Structures are given as structure tokens and as C-alpha cells.
Design a protein around this ligand. Structure first.
Ligand code: SF4
Ligand code: SF4
Lengths: 71, 149
């Protein structure tokens, strides 16, 4: 109850009868990634600290000049 | 030895049997069915055309779809020993062997319900209980009779 149902066309024996077409193509599609990776590329310590301190000093100087004008 | 004997015999029966269980009542009660499921194989290897015969009428009590008369002669032996009236008989030869009165007569005797109980595979079946229910659906209570004495 299987021969022609599975494949009738031209085989001589029960082996090499069917064509399946079920799973993956030859190659495993890829090597995939699973490990985390988060790059840390922001200005780390001294850049940000100098930015804060320098902009603070310069902002204070600007406040001084402005209060001079306003007076 | 015995296991293979049973497997082969069941193979032959189910080979030249019809394939109409889901309409053939006694499906759920059938000996042949349970015997195959419990003792026979699980795969059939057969493709060619089977044999089919025409159904028969035996009065408004025992309708028969003789497509599945597996040539047991239970009904014949009953009708000739216990019933008393000799009407049913097995006629033909080889695969072409039917059971049926040759002159399309009816069966004017009682115990024909006993015939429909005797006949294991679902061919001789009560007409007024044509397709009303399978067996697994209804409950049985054991009582006595009051019509007869
Ligand atoms: S009597 Fe035969 S055909 Fe009907 S249910 Fe049983 S196995 Fe199927
Ligand atoms: S069990 Fe019924 S249908 Fe089968 S061979 Fe016997 S009389 Fe015929």
C-alpha cells in the first residue's frame, strides 16, 4: 500500500523510490551568533570630566562678562 | 508458528474484504475487527481490484449487504439446525461464492434476529435498527421478557 503512492514512476526496486524534500539546504545556512557583544566606545573618564569642568569655568566667565554688561 | 498462522489468515480475510467500516454498523462490535486489531498484522500489501456482490433482501427484519459475506456458514448451520426451516444456503464456487436463497424468497420463521446475532461480521443486520447508533454509545440493562411466557 506504499509503492505507487509514495512514487509510481520508474523505480525497479522499493529502494531509491521516493523524493522527500523536507529539511535544510547543504551548509547549515550559516554560522550564527549567540554571544553578547556591546561595544563601549564613549568618552570614558577624563574626556567627560574635563568637558564638565572646562565648560563650567567658561560659563562662569561668560556670566561675569554678561553681568558687567547688565550693570 | 501459531502467531504467523493467525497473521496470514487475517491478512487474507482483510485482503478480500470490503472497506466500508465507517458506514457498516457492527463497526465497534465486529469480531473480525477486534480479532485483526489484537492478533493480526498492521499493514496490508494489496492494490488490485477486489470482488463485490449485490446486496440482498430477506424480509423486513434482516437486511444484508453481502459484499462482506466471508463464507463462514454460521447462518447456514443455524438455519438448518436450530431454526428448522431450510432456506439459506451457500451457493457458488471459489471467490465467487454467495449466501442467499436462490429464488429471492423471504424467511418466514422466527429466530432470524438470532441469525443477525450469530453472523459476526456486519452483513446480516436488523433493518429497524439500520443506522441509529453504534454500540459504544448506549447503556445496557439486564432484564427479563414479558411478551412470551
Ligand atoms: S463487519 Fe467487517 S466491514 Fe463491517 S465494521 Fe466489521 S471489519 Fe468493517
Ligand atoms: S459472518 Fe455473516 S456475512 Fe460473514 S460469511 Fe458468515 S453469514 Fe456471511
Amino acid at each position: 500500500t506504499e509503492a505507487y503512492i509514495r512514487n509510481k514512476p520508474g523505480m525497479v526496486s522499493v529502494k531509491d523510490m521516493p523524493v522527500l524534500q523536507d529539511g535544510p539546504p547543504p551548509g547549515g545556512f550559516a554560522p550564527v551568533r549567540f554571544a553578547r557583544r556591546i561595544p563601549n566606545k564613549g568618552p570614558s573618564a577624563v574626556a567627560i570630566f574635563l568637558a564638565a569642568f572646562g565648560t563650567f569655568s567658561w560659563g562662569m566667565y561668560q556670566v561675569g562678562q554678561g553681568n558687567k554688561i547688565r550693570r | 508458528v501459531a502467531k504467523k498462522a493467525r497473521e496470514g489468515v487475517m491478512e487474507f480475510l482483510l485482503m478480500n474484504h470490503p472497506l466500508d467500516c465507517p458506514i457498516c454498523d457492527q463497526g465497534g462490535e465486529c469480531d473480525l475487527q477486534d480479532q485483526s486489531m489484537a492478533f493480526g498484522s498492521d499493514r496490508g500489501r494489496f492494490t488490485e481490484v477486489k470482488r463485490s456482490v449485490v446486496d440482498k433482501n430477506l424480509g423486513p427484519l434482516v437486511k444484508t449487504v453481502m459484499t462482506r459475506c466471508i463464507q463462514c456458514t454460521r447462518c447456514v448451520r443455524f438455519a438448518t439446525e436450530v431454526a428448522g426451516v431450510q432456506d439459506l444456503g451457500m451457493l457458488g464456487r471459489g471467490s465467487g461464492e454467495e449466501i442467499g436463497t436462490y429464488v429471492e424468497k423471504l424467511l418466514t420463521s422466527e429466530l432470524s434476529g438470532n441469525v443477525i446475532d450469530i453472523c459476526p461480521v456486519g452483513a446480516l443486520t436488523s433493518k429497524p435498527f439500520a443506522f441509529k447508533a453504534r454500540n459504544w454509545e448506549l447503556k445496557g440493562t439486564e432484564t427479563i421478557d414479558v411478551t412470551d411466557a
